[PDB]
Amino acid sequence: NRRPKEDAFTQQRLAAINPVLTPRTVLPLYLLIAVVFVIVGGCILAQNSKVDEVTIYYQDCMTNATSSWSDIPSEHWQFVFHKYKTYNTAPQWRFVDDESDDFTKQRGTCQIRFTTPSDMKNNVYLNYVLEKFAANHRRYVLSFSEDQIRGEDASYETVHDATGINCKPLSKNADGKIYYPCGLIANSMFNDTFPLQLTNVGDTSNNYSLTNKGINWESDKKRYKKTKYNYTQIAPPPYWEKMYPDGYNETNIPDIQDWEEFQNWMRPGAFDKITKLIRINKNDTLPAGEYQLDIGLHWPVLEFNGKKGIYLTHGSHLGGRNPFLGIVYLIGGCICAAMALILLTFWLFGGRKIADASSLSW
Amino acid sequence: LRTVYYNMPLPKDMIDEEGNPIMQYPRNKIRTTKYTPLTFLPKNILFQFHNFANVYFLVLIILGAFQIFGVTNPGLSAVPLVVIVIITAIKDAIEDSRRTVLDLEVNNTKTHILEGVENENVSTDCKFAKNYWKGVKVGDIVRIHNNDEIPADIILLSTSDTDGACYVETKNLDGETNLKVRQSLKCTNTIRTSKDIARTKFWIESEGPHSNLYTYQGNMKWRNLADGEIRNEPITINNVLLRGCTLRNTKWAMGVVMFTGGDTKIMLNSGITPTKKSRISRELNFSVVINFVLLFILCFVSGIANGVYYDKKGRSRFSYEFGTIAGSAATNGFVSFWVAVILYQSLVPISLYISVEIIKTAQAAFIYGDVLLYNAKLDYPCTPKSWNISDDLGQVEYIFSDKTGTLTQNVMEFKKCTINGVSYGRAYTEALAGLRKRQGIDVETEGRREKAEIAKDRDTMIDELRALSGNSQFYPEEVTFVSKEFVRDLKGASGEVQQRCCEHFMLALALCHSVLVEANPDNPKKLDLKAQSPDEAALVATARDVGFSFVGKTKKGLIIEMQGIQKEFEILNILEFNSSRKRMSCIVKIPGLNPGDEPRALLICKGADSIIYSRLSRQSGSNSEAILEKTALHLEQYATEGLRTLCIAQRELSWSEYEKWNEKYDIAAASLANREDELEVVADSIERELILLGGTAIEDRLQDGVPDCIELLAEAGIKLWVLTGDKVETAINIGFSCNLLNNEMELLVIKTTGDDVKEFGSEPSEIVDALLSKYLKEYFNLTGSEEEIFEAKKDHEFPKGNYAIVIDGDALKLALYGEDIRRKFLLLCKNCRAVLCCRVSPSQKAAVVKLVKDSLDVMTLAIGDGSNDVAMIQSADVGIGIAGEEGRQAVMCSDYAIGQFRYLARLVLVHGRWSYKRLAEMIPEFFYKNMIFALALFWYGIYNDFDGSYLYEYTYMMFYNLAFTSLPVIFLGILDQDVNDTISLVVPQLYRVGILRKEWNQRKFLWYMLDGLYQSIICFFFPYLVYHKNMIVTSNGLGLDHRYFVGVYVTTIAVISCNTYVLLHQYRWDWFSGLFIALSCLVVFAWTGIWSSAIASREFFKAAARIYGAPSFWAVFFVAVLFCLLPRFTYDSFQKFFYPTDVEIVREMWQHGHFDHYPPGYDPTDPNRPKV
Ligand SMILES: CCCCCCCCCCCCCCCCCC(=O)O[C@H](COC(=O)CCCCCCCCCCCCCCC)COP(=O)(O)OCC[N+](C)(C)C
Ligand SMILES: CCCCCCCCCCCCCCCCCC(=O)O[C@H](COC(=O)CCCCCCCCCCCCCCC)COP(=O)(O)OCC[N+](C)(C)C
Ligand SMILES: *[C@@H]1O[C@H](CO)[C@@H](O[C@@H]2O[C@H](CO)[C@@H](O[C@@H]3O[C@H](CO)[C@@H](O)[C@H](O)[C@@H]3O)[C@H](O)[C@H]2NC(C)=O)[C@H](O)[C@H]1NC(C)=O
Ligand code: BEF
Ligand SMILES: [Mg+2]
């Protein structure tokens, strides 16, 4: 017949709970969430406060530093050490001109001598920070070639004519040799030569070694693969034309699978501040001493008033020193504990019965 | 003006070739459908584009197809709009294909058309061969048999009965429960067989199809045989069979077809089935405009802030990007405006009109598939026919019910009678007005009436031929006692004058009637009663059951089996019942006790009680004035129970005075003075001095739970106005039996008196049609107001005033004419506790609905069955049809179709009250859910100078409104229940939040827009403030600083905080919605666990390995889901403790076991329900 099927789904009789928010169940739900989030945020701020860091901005080293060891002004450097909270022994800095470079906008070597009163632990991260460099405009972040990242000898109509992501302003040069790391992202790669060690000032054969391996994820070598262009087909990018003065030989075409400093720059920063890892040591503790950074200056920032610096740290499991997560869990507890208190003291002094406040039968 | 020719070629008014006639009559096909198959696609697309976001999406495809803004894949972004328009149109065609299968039942149901050539035909023997209903054309000759419906408007030619009389059942055209007599034409009255009608040539000069049920004008012209001459013969309305009618008590009726298709009166009093966009659906366009303003503000801010960046000087755009042109842009905030329009386009989501339509289609599927709206007798479930207005059934304030077939069962039952001032009759009809004080434990009396029927059936076993069973015996009274007979002696007849009064009363009920005799083809030893009115069918059948079996009629008189013996009564005269008379009288002949004498003559008059007590004898010395107090007390007691009363009065005549009366009766019979008042005075002269035998009482049976359904609807604040097609006093009795008139009300009867409609003249002064405006003002001092209806539409009470409006239809035509009298007529009807509108046309039923719907801003229901209710069903906001054994137009034109009236409580108070609250919650939950995600594309604009880059990887933007968040919203709109289905009927006062419109406001929308604006600040700036210090968030220092990885932080907070916001705003956490909230929470981790293992991710390549393995992801996740949900879970907990709604308090009682003693599926409007 036409009698509908009675199976408790079609009759809308599924098993259910019907939760009713009484204050005997809701007010212990706030106190549980409030006690959890003040124990969590109390343990986050304890582990966050023990994160030491060294931030030295060196963008003014050609002009505000001379050929002798003078102090860095306090505008540029910040130290955080939890066992030495009144630490103010300023790092020194020195400029070596290198007149045979003939670039004159950013050349030479900036020699930074910082002092660390406490030792950073086993894994030491040497980041570089960039401020006011905008790597997040909508034409910048789409300008690269996905085919050339995966190690393919892509044509001109697959690096320039692709649909969303293409090397649109920087595809090929005047004679026609297409740029191998193309687009604005790979062209404007950060230049500054950082050393492969920290020179222990005051000691010999105790230099803290650093490396450019283990600088990106190991899983990025499945995507960044060695190229299959010949030297004839490709040319260096128009701002890489000083590292490669003769262009690409049959020996100097860069393997981007093993070159992890390129692989970090091809991941653009989301925000105005950019922090990318460039040196690491996974082996040794960095002892408490005065060390020396020797930065080959090649990267211009002062034409857009941007800063340019160094972030030496051993982070935490949350990463970096940021006081936000510990404060905002403690705010989440002290709000859930306060509005457990406000609704309870409104309940003992207002309050109603659970049966007959209904407007139908007044 | 049409002139239908038959059996004759047309004149030279056939100028149209390729098909000879010009006028092109419609075909006899009903439509009942929203779309014809030709213009389905143009009309359904415009119905979808009256939604304002659908012309918003169409603009984004036009503007996105230009390479100025650089939209990637401009032909793939049209795919989400195109497939939603196709899926909604396939759904609307499947919805509209189910109205066409009921058309094919109606257009194929086997009428009988003569096989003669019809010269009013298109281009593209002589038997009555069986043809289709759609094959009926204008000019056909149709033989309509017994008991089948009539195909078109038929000018009646001949009947099976001699002198050409029919009987039609106009309960489809009207509410008239009596059969109407339709006379055939006296020209073609001898035309009997199929060979006679083929040799007859004539034509009909008619008028236009003018939509008035009670009027027709026509001329039949036929050239006379053996004398060349035209002979006109007038055609009026009682010569006409209309399309809604059904031929009863006649073997065949032949006639000409004149009006087919939309020319018939039931089609002209109806319209095209409207599409009926719901009120929440209509008010959704204004909420989209609130988003068009919010989109405009965000694109205006981003358009001016981008141009402020493009005329700065010390920016890294000049050195490393190759936008080295320091000029070229002073205010380029036009091209940066509409980049943000493409960037922020998901702030009005594509999934809006497809989510809310899966809701409405699946809410219609659960109305269709429940067993408590299933009618087991008709084999008929509730059939939703409009699959998009289930939420309108939760806001209904006014019900405009029909009476006949809708409130009533079309079964009359003789229940009570008075014989010489003794009340004979036992019935528990509506003694349940006492539910205030005493219990509903009186199911013991329904068994106490039941044993008294069996004890009466075992006591009436004297020799009766057709004492068949109790199945045709509907008069339980064990006081049928023939007392002090066959006990003391054999002769007797000394005392017990009441026994002589009982057997003469029931004899008069077997004498004064016009009931004919036909043999039942099943069991031909038992014959049944073929009456005109069903009142007289119940009077003759109940005298048949107590002993006086009317077994036939002769040309001398009636054969009446008076308890075995078939005594013959010679009928002398018959005075037929009439509307002006309100009386039927029968002169019978007493037989002779003295030999050689011509004996006397007895007058037996029956009729209405109000006019027979005028016609009684005041000059008596018997008990003819002390019983008048007892009988008139009873007939007031019977009418307030809701029973049709009918006095029985007599006078014995001397046979010489009767011959003097017959001498004047033959004067008024040999002349044609029947239209004149000559015959009605001769009948009046004999009907003046009368002795009262007593009265009767007949129950017009309601449907099964009709006074229980109206009781639940009135407790919900819903107002019932019975709009009636038949007489005033009939609906007043149904008012008292449905508990709508209460016996202490003041019936404010309008009752116009003059036959003058406000149509012509009488401008400076009137004397006969200022009456209606007068006592509208006079009844506006007991209701002490004049005209203020702006204050009235702020009031949604019942009221408590114990008044009732009875307007008579002809006075309704003048109370609906001008603006100032409509305002006073509405204000009086709104202030009364019951409104009865009687003798009302199909146009005026729609007019009362449109008056209440347009003046007050309210929601109307309009249940009915019958083609007079179609215009009322179509012109209301919802329309309910009540289904029967037959195929009904009011079912096909309706929006829902229930088998019985009592299902309207289960339909409105359960399904509509759910479907209102399911969709008044979901729609603010839906715009909340999108803008928690789309606004983080704006808040990221602050940190890239509003240049126009995307925060999200492109598979997050596709699958947010499609996969990760789409299912908790949809299973809230389909399966959410504030309370159980029994509690919706135990507590009908929970319905009042829909009448007061307290669940869907544009104010409620703005707080969900403000709760959505707040959490996007939480969903963006909580991942921002863990990156903002030094951009390192991973435990191994390797860097998650890509913008797609920040978008993973934001999306996972937004998806979990949405799907747990939807969970907290569900009543009834069941296992089905609880499973698919969890699977929507776990498909955001699963898709990026799969898509970020492929090399096709292209920037995103190991996102789920790197982000989900980062402890800073799982620290941002729990604190940001807190601050998203904490200002709303606190506001609700403050609301639910100190300002609780009624439905929060009823849920508190339901947890405390105040409703556990009700069975699952408890139906209070059920006669066969258990005890509570
Ligand atoms: C452009 C490419 C197109 C390709 C094809 C597109 C998809 C086509 C799908 C095939 C057709 C599906 C039809 C489903 C019908 C469901 C409705 C139904 O069964 O009955 C309906 C039930 O109607 C109701 O009252 C309940 C509401 C219907 C709920 C389900 C609607 C399903 C169809 C519409 C959406 C389908 C999905 C469309 C995606 C494009 C009609 O009732 P009835 O009594 O008149 O039916 C006759 C019953 N008997 C036979 C017993 C007398
Ligand atoms: C728990 C596991 C869930 C697995 C997935 C289940 C999916 C269930 C879907 C049920 C219906 C609800 C969704 C209806 C369609 C939403 C379409 C949608 O939003 O997705 C589109 C995806 O676009 C596409 O290319 C895909 C088109 C697919 C269209 C699917 C239509 C589905 C109709 C289903 C009808 C029958 C339903 C049966 C009962 C559920 C993106 O729109 P957006 O607003 O999210 O983003 C706009 C921004 N851009 C332009 C950049 C993309
Ligand atoms: C990264 O390193 C390179 C060199 O190590 C930096 O210098 C860029 O050097 C190229 C070629 O040496 C310059 O192109 C030349 O510009 C001059 C003056 O406009 C023009 O005469 C030449 O024909 C050629 O176009 C380039 O201008 C120069 N970069 C800048 C910003 O001036 C480079 O600056 C470092 N940074 C970036 C973002 O690449
Ligand atoms: F007899 Be009806 F129009 F409900
Ligand atoms: Mg009616």
PDB file of N, CA, C and O and ligand atoms in Angstrom, chain B residues 170-177 401-408 410 723-725 845 863-870 872 882 888 890, ligand 4:
ATOM      1  N   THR B 170     -24.139  19.712  -5.667  1.00  0.00           N
ATOM      2  CA  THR B 170     -23.327  20.924  -5.680  1.00  0.00           C
ATOM      3  C   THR B 170     -22.637  21.166  -4.341  1.00  0.00           C
ATOM      4  O   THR B 170     -22.708  22.258  -3.791  1.00  0.00           O
ATOM      5  N   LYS B 171     -21.955  20.161  -3.804  1.00  0.00           N
ATOM      6  CA  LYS B 171     -21.064  20.393  -2.677  1.00  0.00           C
ATOM      7  C   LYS B 171     -19.639  20.647  -3.136  1.00  0.00           C
ATOM      8  O   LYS B 171     -18.755  20.882  -2.306  1.00  0.00           O
ATOM      9  N   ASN B 172     -19.411  20.598  -4.441  1.00  0.00           N
ATOM     10  CA  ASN B 172     -18.153  20.916  -5.093  1.00  0.00           C
ATOM     11  C   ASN B 172     -18.154  22.360  -5.583  1.00  0.00           C
ATOM     12  O   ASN B 172     -17.127  23.039  -5.518  1.00  0.00           O
ATOM     13  N   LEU B 173     -19.301  22.836  -6.073  1.00  0.00           N
ATOM     14  CA  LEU B 173     -19.469  24.238  -6.431  1.00  0.00           C
ATOM     15  C   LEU B 173     -19.755  25.106  -5.223  1.00  0.00           C
ATOM     16  O   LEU B 173     -19.423  26.293  -5.225  1.00  0.00           O
ATOM     17  N   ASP B 174     -20.421  24.547  -4.221  1.00  0.00           N
ATOM     18  CA  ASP B 174     -20.927  25.288  -3.076  1.00  0.00           C
ATOM     19  C   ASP B 174     -20.666  24.458  -1.832  1.00  0.00           C
ATOM     20  O   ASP B 174     -19.900  23.493  -1.850  1.00  0.00           O
ATOM     21  N   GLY B 175     -21.306  24.838  -0.741  1.00  0.00           N
ATOM     22  CA  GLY B 175     -21.403  23.984   0.416  1.00  0.00           C
ATOM     23  C   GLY B 175     -22.748  23.318   0.550  1.00  0.00           C
ATOM     24  O   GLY B 175     -23.023  22.721   1.597  1.00  0.00           O
ATOM     25  N   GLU B 176     -23.591  23.402  -0.476  1.00  0.00           N
ATOM     26  CA  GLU B 176     -24.982  22.971  -0.411  1.00  0.00           C
ATOM     27  C   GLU B 176     -25.049  21.455  -0.295  1.00  0.00           C
ATOM     28  O   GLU B 176     -24.738  20.736  -1.247  1.00  0.00           O
ATOM     29  N   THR B 177     -25.458  20.968   0.875  1.00  0.00           N
ATOM     30  CA  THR B 177     -25.542  19.537   1.125  1.00  0.00           C
ATOM     31  C   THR B 177     -26.754  18.886   0.478  1.00  0.00           C
ATOM     32  O   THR B 177     -26.847  17.656   0.481  1.00  0.00           O
ATOM     33  N   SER B 401     -11.300  28.394   7.097  1.00  0.00           N
ATOM     34  CA  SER B 401     -11.784  27.056   6.808  1.00  0.00           C
ATOM     35  C   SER B 401     -13.095  27.085   6.041  1.00  0.00           C
ATOM     36  O   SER B 401     -13.930  27.967   6.241  1.00  0.00           O
ATOM     37  N   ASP B 402     -13.266  26.112   5.160  1.00  0.00           N
ATOM     38  CA  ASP B 402     -14.567  25.818   4.591  1.00  0.00           C
ATOM     39  C   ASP B 402     -15.327  24.910   5.553  1.00  0.00           C
ATOM     40  O   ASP B 402     -14.752  24.349   6.486  1.00  0.00           O
ATOM     41  N   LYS B 403     -16.637  24.791   5.353  1.00  0.00           N
ATOM     42  CA  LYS B 403     -17.456  23.972   6.235  1.00  0.00           C
ATOM     43  C   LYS B 403     -17.780  22.602   5.648  1.00  0.00           C
ATOM     44  O   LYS B 403     -17.423  21.578   6.232  1.00  0.00           O
ATOM     45  N   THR B 404     -18.442  22.568   4.494  1.00  0.00           N
ATOM     46  CA  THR B 404     -19.004  21.333   3.957  1.00  0.00           C
ATOM     47  C   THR B 404     -17.916  20.491   3.304  1.00  0.00           C
ATOM     48  O   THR B 404     -17.261  20.942   2.362  1.00  0.00           O
ATOM     49  N   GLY B 405     -17.732  19.267   3.797  1.00  0.00           N
ATOM     50  CA  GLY B 405     -16.678  18.385   3.353  1.00  0.00           C
ATOM     51  C   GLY B 405     -15.347  18.625   4.031  1.00  0.00           C
ATOM     52  O   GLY B 405     -14.522  17.712   4.107  1.00  0.00           O
ATOM     53  N   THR B 406     -15.121  19.841   4.524  1.00  0.00           N
ATOM     54  CA  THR B 406     -13.913  20.221   5.237  1.00  0.00           C
ATOM     55  C   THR B 406     -14.088  20.065   6.743  1.00  0.00           C
ATOM     56  O   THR B 406     -13.331  19.337   7.385  1.00  0.00           O
ATOM     57  N   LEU B 407     -15.079  20.736   7.320  1.00  0.00           N
ATOM     58  CA  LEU B 407     -15.388  20.528   8.726  1.00  0.00           C
ATOM     59  C   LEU B 407     -16.361  19.385   8.936  1.00  0.00           C
ATOM     60  O   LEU B 407     -16.367  18.775  10.008  1.00  0.00           O
ATOM     61  N   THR B 408     -17.178  19.083   7.939  1.00  0.00           N
ATOM     62  CA  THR B 408     -18.237  18.101   8.063  1.00  0.00           C
ATOM     63  C   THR B 408     -17.859  16.838   7.301  1.00  0.00           C
ATOM     64  O   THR B 408     -16.912  16.812   6.515  1.00  0.00           O
ATOM     65  N   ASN B 410     -20.284  14.979   5.574  1.00  0.00           N
ATOM     66  CA  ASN B 410     -21.355  14.769   4.585  1.00  0.00           C
ATOM     67  C   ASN B 410     -22.196  13.533   4.903  1.00  0.00           C
ATOM     68  O   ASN B 410     -22.645  12.819   4.008  1.00  0.00           O
ATOM     69  N   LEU B 723     -15.536  30.094   6.424  1.00  0.00           N
ATOM     70  CA  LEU B 723     -16.062  30.711   5.218  1.00  0.00           C
ATOM     71  C   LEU B 723     -16.889  29.660   4.493  1.00  0.00           C
ATOM     72  O   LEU B 723     -16.364  28.616   4.102  1.00  0.00           O
ATOM     73  N   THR B 724     -18.171  29.938   4.308  1.00  0.00           N
ATOM     74  CA  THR B 724     -19.165  28.908   4.051  1.00  0.00           C
ATOM     75  C   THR B 724     -19.843  29.154   2.712  1.00  0.00           C
ATOM     76  O   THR B 724     -20.106  30.300   2.342  1.00  0.00           O
ATOM     77  N   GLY B 725     -20.121  28.080   1.984  1.00  0.00           N
ATOM     78  CA  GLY B 725     -20.811  28.192   0.719  1.00  0.00           C
ATOM     79  C   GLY B 725     -22.321  28.073   0.789  1.00  0.00           C
ATOM     80  O   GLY B 725     -23.006  28.481  -0.152  1.00  0.00           O
ATOM     81  N   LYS B 845     -14.530  34.385  -0.845  1.00  0.00           N
ATOM     82  CA  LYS B 845     -13.638  33.647   0.042  1.00  0.00           C
ATOM     83  C   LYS B 845     -12.202  34.094  -0.150  1.00  0.00           C
ATOM     84  O   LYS B 845     -11.452  34.232   0.820  1.00  0.00           O
ATOM     85  N   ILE B 863      -7.789  26.187   4.564  1.00  0.00           N
ATOM     86  CA  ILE B 863      -8.054  24.781   4.265  1.00  0.00           C
ATOM     87  C   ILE B 863      -9.419  24.643   3.592  1.00  0.00           C
ATOM     88  O   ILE B 863     -10.344  25.414   3.856  1.00  0.00           O
ATOM     89  N   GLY B 864      -9.543  23.689   2.675  1.00  0.00           N
ATOM     90  CA  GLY B 864     -10.841  23.400   2.094  1.00  0.00           C
ATOM     91  C   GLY B 864     -10.766  22.255   1.110  1.00  0.00           C
ATOM     92  O   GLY B 864      -9.692  21.860   0.657  1.00  0.00           O
ATOM     93  N   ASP B 865     -11.942  21.727   0.782  1.00  0.00           N
ATOM     94  CA  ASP B 865     -12.093  20.805  -0.332  1.00  0.00           C
ATOM     95  C   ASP B 865     -13.241  21.265  -1.212  1.00  0.00           C
ATOM     96  O   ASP B 865     -14.246  21.784  -0.724  1.00  0.00           O
ATOM     97  N   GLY B 866     -13.084  21.099  -2.501  1.00  0.00           N
ATOM     98  CA  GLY B 866     -14.100  21.693  -3.335  1.00  0.00           C
ATOM     99  C   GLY B 866     -13.533  22.811  -4.181  1.00  0.00           C
ATOM    100  O   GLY B 866     -12.606  23.524  -3.783  1.00  0.00           O
ATOM    101  N   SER B 867     -14.102  22.970  -5.368  1.00  0.00           N
ATOM    102  CA  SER B 867     -13.632  23.941  -6.337  1.00  0.00           C
ATOM    103  C   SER B 867     -14.053  25.362  -6.004  1.00  0.00           C
ATOM    104  O   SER B 867     -13.564  26.297  -6.645  1.00  0.00           O
ATOM    105  N   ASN B 868     -14.941  25.554  -5.029  1.00  0.00           N
ATOM    106  CA  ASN B 868     -15.179  26.898  -4.526  1.00  0.00           C
ATOM    107  C   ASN B 868     -14.093  27.362  -3.566  1.00  0.00           C
ATOM    108  O   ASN B 868     -14.030  28.553  -3.251  1.00  0.00           O
ATOM    109  N   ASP B 869     -13.236  26.458  -3.110  1.00  0.00           N
ATOM    110  CA  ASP B 869     -12.175  26.786  -2.179  1.00  0.00           C
ATOM    111  C   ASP B 869     -10.826  26.956  -2.850  1.00  0.00           C
ATOM    112  O   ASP B 869      -9.854  27.251  -2.161  1.00  0.00           O
ATOM    113  N   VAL B 870     -10.750  26.781  -4.171  1.00  0.00           N
ATOM    114  CA  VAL B 870      -9.465  26.815  -4.863  1.00  0.00           C
ATOM    115  C   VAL B 870      -8.893  28.225  -4.860  1.00  0.00           C
ATOM    116  O   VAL B 870      -7.713  28.427  -4.551  1.00  0.00           O
ATOM    117  N   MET B 872      -9.575  30.533  -2.729  1.00  0.00           N
ATOM    118  CA  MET B 872      -9.173  30.799  -1.355  1.00  0.00           C
ATOM    119  C   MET B 872      -7.847  30.118  -1.026  1.00  0.00           C
ATOM    120  O   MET B 872      -7.017  30.678  -0.305  1.00  0.00           O
ATOM    121  N   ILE B 882      -8.282  18.954   1.399  1.00  0.00           N
ATOM    122  CA  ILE B 882      -8.675  17.729   2.079  1.00  0.00           C
ATOM    123  C   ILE B 882      -9.079  16.712   1.025  1.00  0.00           C
ATOM    124  O   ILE B 882      -9.957  16.977   0.197  1.00  0.00           O
ATOM    125  N   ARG B 888     -10.079  15.598  -6.424  1.00  0.00           N
ATOM    126  CA  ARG B 888     -10.582  16.923  -6.097  1.00  0.00           C
ATOM    127  C   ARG B 888      -9.645  17.997  -6.628  1.00  0.00           C
ATOM    128  O   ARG B 888      -8.424  17.854  -6.558  1.00  0.00           O
ATOM    129  N   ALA B 890      -9.383  21.011  -5.335  1.00  0.00           N
ATOM    130  CA  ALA B 890      -8.783  21.677  -4.186  1.00  0.00           C
ATOM    131  C   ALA B 890      -7.588  20.924  -3.635  1.00  0.00           C
ATOM    132  O   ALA B 890      -6.793  21.515  -2.907  1.00  0.00           O
TER     133      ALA B 890
HETATM  134  F1  BEF C   4     -18.024  21.314   0.201  1.00  0.00           F
HETATM  135 BE1  BEF C   4     -16.586  22.316   0.359  1.00  0.00          BE
HETATM  136  F2  BEF C   4     -16.311  23.640  -0.767  1.00  0.00           F
HETATM  137  F3  BEF C   4     -15.414  21.995   1.635  1.00  0.00           F
END
